[PDB]
Scaffold this active site. Structure first.
Site, PDB file in Angstrom:
ATOM      1  N   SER A 180      28.218   3.170   7.986  1.00  0.00           N
ATOM      2  CA  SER A 180      29.327   4.123   8.111  1.00  0.00           C
ATOM      3  C   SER A 180      30.571   3.486   8.669  1.00  0.00           C
ATOM      4  O   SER A 180      31.642   4.013   8.426  1.00  0.00           O
ATOM      5  CB  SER A 180      29.018   5.330   8.992  1.00  0.00           C
ATOM      6  OG  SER A 180      27.664   5.461   9.259  1.00  0.00           O
TER       7      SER A 180
ATOM      8  N   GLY B  47      41.385   5.123   6.721  1.00  0.00           N
ATOM      9  CA  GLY B  47      42.773   5.350   6.377  1.00  0.00           C
ATOM     10  C   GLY B  47      43.713   4.299   6.922  1.00  0.00           C
ATOM     11  O   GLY B  47      44.691   3.946   6.265  1.00  0.00           O
TER      12      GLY B  47
ATOM     13  N   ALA C  18      44.139   8.662   9.947  1.00  0.00           N
ATOM     14  CA  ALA C  18      44.240   7.350  10.589  1.00  0.00           C
ATOM     15  C   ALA C  18      43.016   6.971  11.431  1.00  0.00           C
ATOM     16  O   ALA C  18      43.152   6.535  12.575  1.00  0.00           O
ATOM     17  CB  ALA C  18      45.498   7.279  11.419  1.00  0.00           C
TER      18      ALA C  18
ATOM     19  N   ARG D 183      11.617  13.604  10.958  1.00  0.00           N
ATOM     20  CA  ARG D 183      12.759  14.358  11.444  1.00  0.00           C
ATOM     21  C   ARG D 183      13.075  15.620  10.623  1.00  0.00           C
ATOM     22  O   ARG D 183      13.536  16.600  11.177  1.00  0.00           O
ATOM     23  CB  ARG D 183      13.988  13.465  11.659  1.00  0.00           C
ATOM     24  CG  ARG D 183      14.457  12.570  10.533  1.00  0.00           C
ATOM     25  CD  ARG D 183      15.069  11.307  11.141  1.00  0.00           C
ATOM     26  NE  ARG D 183      15.988  10.605  10.242  1.00  0.00           N
ATOM     27  CZ  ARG D 183      15.696   9.559   9.462  1.00  0.00           C
ATOM     28  NH1 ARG D 183      14.465   9.046   9.406  1.00  0.00           N
ATOM     29  NH2 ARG D 183      16.662   9.027   8.704  1.00  0.00           N
TER      30      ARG D 183
END
Ligand SMILES: *Cc1cc2c(cc1C)nc1c(=O)[nH]c(=O)nc-1n2C[C@H](O)[C@H](O)[C@H](O)COP(=O)(O)OP(=O)(O)OC[C@H]1O[C@@H](n2cnc3c(N)ncnc32)[C@H](O)[C@@H]1O
Ligand code: NA
Lengths: 537, 86
Positions: free
Chosen positions: A358, A19, A15, A240
Site C-alpha cells: 500500500s 498524489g 496530497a 479473520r
C-alpha cells in the site's frame, strides 16, 4: 466564466504519498501542476504508515490477491518498486511523515503550485464527456474556483468511514469515489474492503491478533466464549473472516455488549495475569487505557471489526488513466481523468492488500502517472473547453446544501449509513440481509437529499465540508453494497455466508459498478505479464 | 487569533484516527474553558507533526517546550475525564 478559472496542465486532487509523487513527476517533466489538499499534506492518512526475488514478491502479491490481482500491474510494481523507492532516498515511526515531508519539500522546490486546505467538489465535464478539471472551494475564504486542466488526477485516498469502525483518519470520506461516480465513471472491486476483526470499539485502533495468540478470547453480553459455537476447533484463532463475521452476527442478533463505546464484543485478557500482559503485550495495555478507557489487566477490551483498506476504486491502467467500458464490454479510457493510490484499482491488491504494497503502489503508480502524463495527454488529444453550464453542473450539489438550512441533520444520516453498512455489508454478507440493506440504503439516501446545512458562513465553514463529505460516503457505500450483493462467492476480504467457496469458474474476475444505471458487470483480470510467465490459479 | 474558532477547528483534522479521537473532542468540549494563553498554546501545538502529537499523548517522549508539555498533559487529563468518544 462567472467563476474564477485557474488553468494548469495537470490538477492533482490529493496530497498523500500518491498524489504528491505524481505532482512531483509532472512538475519535473516541465508541465504546470496544481496540487489540491483538503488538509496540509503532512496530515494525509499516509502519515499513519509505519515500519519503513522480485518474482517472489510478485508471486506473494498475486497469491495474496486471490488471483484477481492484475499480473501485468503487479509485475510492474514488483520490478519497478526498488528503483522507485531509492529515487526518494536519493532526494510511532516517522515513516509516513518522512515520505510526506520529502515529497512536500520536493514539490515546492520544483514549483508545483500547492493549494493547501482546498476542498475539491466535483469533476467538470465538457459536451463530449471528457474531464477538464474540477471545482474546488478555498476552506479559508469559501471562494469557489474552476481548476481547468488537461489531466485531472484523483488521489484522495480511502473511505473507511462508510462503516462504524475504521482505522482511517476522519478525513477519509471517499471524495474521489463520489466525484467519479457522479461524473458517470465506474468503480471496480468495491466489495473488496480489508477489515481487521478486532479494533477498539469507539476508536478503530487495531488490537493485534497476538492478544488471541497469547490466550485472549471473545465474550458476548452473557459472558459466553461464542467462538466455540462458530469455530469449534480454531475458536478465537479462527480465520479473520470467521472471527470478524461472528462478532457482527452476535451484535446484530442482540447479544453484543454496549455502553459508551457502542456495540461490541469483549476481548478478555485478564486471566493471563499482570506479568505476562506487561511482558508480552505492553503496547496493548497502553492503547487500551488511552483509547478503550479500560485496563486489560482488570477488564476486557471492547472490540469490533474495523475497516482498514480500500482495494476497490477507479479502475486504471499502469499509466494512471482512468477506465470505463463501452456496450461491447471493452475497456475505453475516460479522457482527461487519472487516478493514483488507494483511490485507484490498478489492481495490485485484488482481493487482499499485502503488507507494504500500500505504500509501494503510491510511489510506483504516482510516479508512472507523472512519467506518462504527456503521452496520455497526447493520446486523449485537445479537449474542448467546458461551457458555463458545464461548470455550473459541478456546483449543483454544493448549491443544494447552501439552500437547505432546515431539514434533516447530516450527523444522524452519517450514523445510520455507517450502522447499515456495518450490519449488512462489512464482514457479515448474506443475501437476505443484503436485500434489506440495499432498500435501507435507498431510504438513507432519500433523506440525504433533504439534509440541512446550519452554518451559512463562507470562512472556515467545516460543517459545509462535512456535509459535502457525506455525499461521498453515501456514493462509496452504495457502490460497495451493490457490488457485495453481486459477487456470489467468497474470495479474499469479501466473505459470504450463503456462498462460502471461491468460484474461479464464474468469478475469477473484477466487479464493476456502472453509475449511469447503478448496475453491475464483470471485467477481466489481466493474466499477461511481459517478463515472466503468468502465475495460474 | 484565538477567537477564530472555525479556523482552529480545521487544524484538528489529522492524518491519524488516534489524533482525531484525542484532539477534536477536546477542542469541541474544552476550548472555551481555556484562558487566552492556553488557547494560543493549543494553536501552536497543532502546528506540530502528527507522529510527535501521538507519541507525546502516549507518554512516549515530550516536547522541549514547557507550555506545549502542559497542554499535552491537559489534553490527556481531559480526555481521561471524558471517557470513550460517542
Ligand atoms: C489507515 C492506515 C493505513 C495504513 C497504515 C496504518 C493506518 C492506520 N499502515 C500502513 C503500513 O504500515 N504500510 C503500508 O504499506 N500501508 C499502510 N496503510 C495503508 C496506506 O498507508 C494507505 O493506503 C496509503 O498511505 C494511502 O495513500 P494515498 O496517497 O493513496 O492517499 P492518502 O495518504 O489517504 O491521502 C489522501 C489525500 O487526499 C486529500 N483529499 C481527500 N479529499 C479531498 C478533497 N475533496 N479535496 C482535496 N483534497 C482531498 C487529503 O487531504 C490527502 O492529502
Ligand atoms: Na483502491
Amino acid at each position: 466564466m462567472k467563476l474564477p478559472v485557474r488553468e494548469f496542465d495537470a490538477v492533482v486532487i490529493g496530497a498523500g504519498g500518491a498524489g504528491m509523487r505524481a505532482a512531483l513527476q509532472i512538475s519535473q517533466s516541465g508541465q504546470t501542476c496544481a496540487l489540491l489538499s483538503k488538509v496540509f499534506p503532512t496530515r494525509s492518512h499516509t502519515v499513519s504508515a509505519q515500519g519503513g526475488n522480485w518474482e517472489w514478491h510478485m508471486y506473494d502479491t498475486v497469491k495474496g490477491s486471490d488471483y484477481i490481482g492484475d499480473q501485468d500491474a503487479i509485475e510492474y510494481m514488483c520490478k519497478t518498486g526498488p528503483e522507485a523507492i531509492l529515487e526518494l532516498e536519493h532526494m510511532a515511526d516517522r515513516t509516513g511523515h518522512a515520505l510526506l515531508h520529502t515529497l512536500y519539500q520536493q514539490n515546492l522546490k520544483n514549483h508545483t503550485t500547492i493549494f493547501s486546505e482546498w476542498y475539491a467538489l466535483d469533476l467538470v465535464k465538457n459536451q463530449d464527456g471528457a474531464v477538464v478539471g474540477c471545482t474546488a472551494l478555498c476552506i479559508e475564504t469559501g471562494e469557489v474556483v474552476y481548476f481547468k486542466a488537461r489531466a485531472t488526477v484523483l488521489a484522495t485516498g480511502g473511505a473507511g468511514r462508510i462503516y462504524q469502525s475504521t482505522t482511517n483518519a476522519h478525513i477519509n470520506t471517499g471524495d474521489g469515489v463520489g466525484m467519479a461516480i457522479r461524473a458517470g465513471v465506474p468503480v471496480q472491486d468495491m466489495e473488496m474492503w480489508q477489515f481487521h476483526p478486532t479494533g477498539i470499539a469507539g476508536a478503530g485502533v487495531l488490537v493485534t491478533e497476538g492478544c488471541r495468540g497469547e490466550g485472549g478470547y471473545l465474550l458476548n453480553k452473557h459472558g459466553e466464549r461464542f467462538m466455540e459455537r462458530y469455530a469449534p476447533n480454531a475458536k478465537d484463532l479462527a480465520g479473520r473472516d470467521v472471527v470478524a463475521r461472528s462478532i457482527m452476527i452476535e451484535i446484530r442478533e442482540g447479544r453484543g455488549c454496549d455502553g459508551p463505546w457502542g456495540p461490541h464484543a469483549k476481548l478478555k485478557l485478564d486471566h493471563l495475569g499482570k506479568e505476562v500482559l506487561e511482558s508480552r503485550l505492553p503496547g496493548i495495555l497502553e492503547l487500551s487505557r488511552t483509547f478503550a478507557h479500560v485496563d486489560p489487566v482488570k477488564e476486557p477490551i471492547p472490540v469490533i471489526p474495523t475497516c482498514h483498506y480500500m482495494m476497490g476504486g477507479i479502475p486504471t491502467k499502469v499509466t494512471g488513466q482512468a477506465l470505463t467500458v463501452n456496450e461491447k464490454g471493452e475497456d475505453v479510457v475516460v479522457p482527461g481523468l487519472f487516478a493514483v493510490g488507494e483511490i485507484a484499482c490498478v489492481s495490485v491488491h485484488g482481493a487482499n492488500r499485502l503488507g507494504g504494497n500500500s505504500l509501494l503502489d503510491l510511489v510506483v503508480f504516482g510516479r508512472a502517472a507523472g512519467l506518462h502524463l504527456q503521452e496520455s495527454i497526447a493520446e486523449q488529444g485537445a479537449l474542448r473547453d467546458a461551457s458555463e453550464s458545464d461548470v455550473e453542473a459541478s456546483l449543483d450539489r454544493l448549491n443544494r446544501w447552501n439552500n437547505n438550512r432546515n431539514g434533516e441533520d447530516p450527523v444522524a444520516i452519517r450514523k445510520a449509513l455507517q450502522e447499515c453498512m456495518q450490519h449488512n455489508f462489512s464482514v457479515f454478507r448474506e443475501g437476505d440481509a443484503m436485500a434489506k440493506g440495499l432498500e435501507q440504503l435507498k431510504v438513507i439516501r432519500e433523506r440525504l437529499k433533504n439534509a440541512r446545512l446550519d452554518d451559512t458562513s463562507s470562512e472556515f465553514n467545516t460543517q459545509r465540508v462535512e456535509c459535502l463529505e457525506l455525499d461521498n460516503l453515501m456514493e462509496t457505500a452504495y457502490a460497495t453494497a451493490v457490488s457485495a450483493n453481486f459477487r456470489t462467492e467468497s474470495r479474499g476480504a469479501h466473505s459470504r455466508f450463503d456462498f462460502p467457496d471461491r468460484d474461479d469458474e464464474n468469478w475469477l474476475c473484477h466487479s464493476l459498478y456502472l453509475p449511469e444505471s447503478e448496475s453491475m458487470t464483470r471485467r477481466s483480470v489481466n493474466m499477461e505479464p511481459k517478463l515472466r510467465p503468468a502465475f495460474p490459479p | 487569533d484565538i477567537n477564530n474558532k472555525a479556523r482552529i477547528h480545521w487544524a484538528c483534522r489529522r492524518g491519524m484516527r488516534e489524533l482525531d479521537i484525542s484532539i477534536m473532542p477536546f477542542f469541541e468540549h474544552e476550548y472555551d474553558s481555556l484562558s487566552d494563553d492556553e488557547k494560543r498554546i493549543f494553536i501552536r501545538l497543532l502546528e506540530c507533526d502528527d507522529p510527535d502529537l501521538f507519541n507525546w499523548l502516549m507518554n512516549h517522549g515530550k516536547p522541549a517546550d514547557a507550555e506545549l508539555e502542559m497542554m499535552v498533559r491537559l489534553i490527556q487529563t481531559r480526555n481521561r475525564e471524558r471517557g470513550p468518544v460517542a
